[PDB]
Amino acid sequence: VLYVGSKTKEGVVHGVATVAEKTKEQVTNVGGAVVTGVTAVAQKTVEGAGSIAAATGFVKK
Amino acid sequence: VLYVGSKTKEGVVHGVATVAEKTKEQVTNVGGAVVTGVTAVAQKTVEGAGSIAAATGFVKK
Amino acid sequence: VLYVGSKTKEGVVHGVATVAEKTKEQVTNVGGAVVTGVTAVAQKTVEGAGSIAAATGFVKK
Amino acid sequence: VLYVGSKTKEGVVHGVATVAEKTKEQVTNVGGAVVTGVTAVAQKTVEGAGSIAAATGFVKK
Amino acid sequence: VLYVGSKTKEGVVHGVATVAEKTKEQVTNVGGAVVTGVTAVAQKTVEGAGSIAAATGFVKK
Amino acid sequence: VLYVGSKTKEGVVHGVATVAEKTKEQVTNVGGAVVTGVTAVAQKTVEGAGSIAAATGFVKK
Numbered sequence A, B, C, D, E, F: 001v002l003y004v005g006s007k008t009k010e011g012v013v014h015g016v017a018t019v020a021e022k023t024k025e026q027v028t029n030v031g032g033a034v035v036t037g038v039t040a041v042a043q044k045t046v047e048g049a050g051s052i053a054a055a056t057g058f059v060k061k
Helices: none
Strands: A003-004 A005-021 A025-030 A034-036 A037-049 A058-059 B002-020 B025-030 B034-036 B039-047 B055-061 C004-020 C026-029 C035-037 C039-047 C056-060 D003-004 D007-022 D026-030 D034-036 D039-047 D056-060 E002-003 E005-022 E024-028 E033-034 E039-047 E056-060 F002-004 F008-019 F029-032 F035-038 F040-045 F057-058
Touching: A003 E024, A003 F057, A005 A034, A005 B034, A005 F002, A025 A058, A025 B002, A025 E024, A025 E039, A034 F040, A037 B034, A037 D007, A037 F002, A058 B025, B002 B034, B002 B039, B002 C035, B002 C039, B002 D034, B025 B055, B034 B039, B034 C026, B039 C035, B055 C026, C004 C026, C004 C035, C004 C039, C004 D034, C004 D039, C026 C056, C035 C039, C035 D039, C035 D056, C039 D034, C056 D026, C056 D039, D003 D039, D003 E039, D003 F029, D007 D026, D007 D034, D007 E033, D026 D056, D034 D039, D034 F035, D056 F002, E005 E024, E005 F035, E024 E056, E024 F008, E033 E039, E033 F057, E056 F029
Parallel strands: A003 B002, A005 B002, A025 B025, A034 B034, A037 B039, A058 B055, B002 C004, B025 C026, B034 C035, B039 C039, B055 C056, C004 D003, C004 D007, C026 D026, C035 D034, C039 D039, C056 D056, D003 E002, D007 E005, D026 E024, D034 E033, D039 E039, D056 E056, E002 F002, E005 F008, E024 F029, E033 F035, E039 F040, E056 F057
Antiparallel strands: none
């Protein structure tokens, strides 16, 4: 059970913001979900052995 | 059980903000979920042996 | 059981801020979830033996 | 069992902030979740032998 | 069991702040969660033998 | 069992603050959770044999 209650008169929200002017490379990486709103809720469940999540910005070999 | 209650007149929110001007490389890396709002709630459950989370900025080889 | 109650008139919030100008390699890395709001709540559970979390900025091999 | 209550007229909050002008390499690494708000709450459970958390800035081999 | 109460007219809060100019390898590293707010609460539970947390700024091999 | 109470007219709070300019290898490592606020509390539970905290500034080999 999850309850979330919310009331708002004025709401200004910015989730993920990126600016890149003259850079050679820029990377913005997110492994899970991205969730944004004046009321914002996120849930996740994983079941079973040996589960893996491997969020990486970059690789050079 | 989780209860969250919230009431707001004026709310201003910034979650993840990145600026990069002349940098050769820039990386913003996030393993889990990213959740943002005037009211913001996040929950996660992982069950079973040997599970791995490996959030990495970069590798050079 | 967790209860969170919250009432606010004027509120301003910044979660993660990064700015980078003439730098060679800037990295902002986060292992868990990222949660930001006027009211902001985060919960996590992991069950079962030998689980590993390994949040790393970078590797040069 | 956790209870949190809060009332605020004016609130200004900054969680994690990083500035990088002319630096060669620069790392902000966080192992856990990051939680920020006019009211902010974080909870974590690990159950199981031999569990590891290894949050590291960088390695040069 | 924990109770926290809080009432605030004016609050200004800065969590983790980092600034760098001509520096070559500035690191900010944190092992646990980072929690910040006009009211701010953090709780952590580990249950099981052999459990390790090993938060490291850097290594040069 | 714990209780915490708080009423504040005006409060200005800085948690972990870092500045550096010409320095070669400045490191801000922290081995626990980082918690900061006009009211701020942190608690931690570790149960079972063999439990290790191994927070490290840096290693050179």
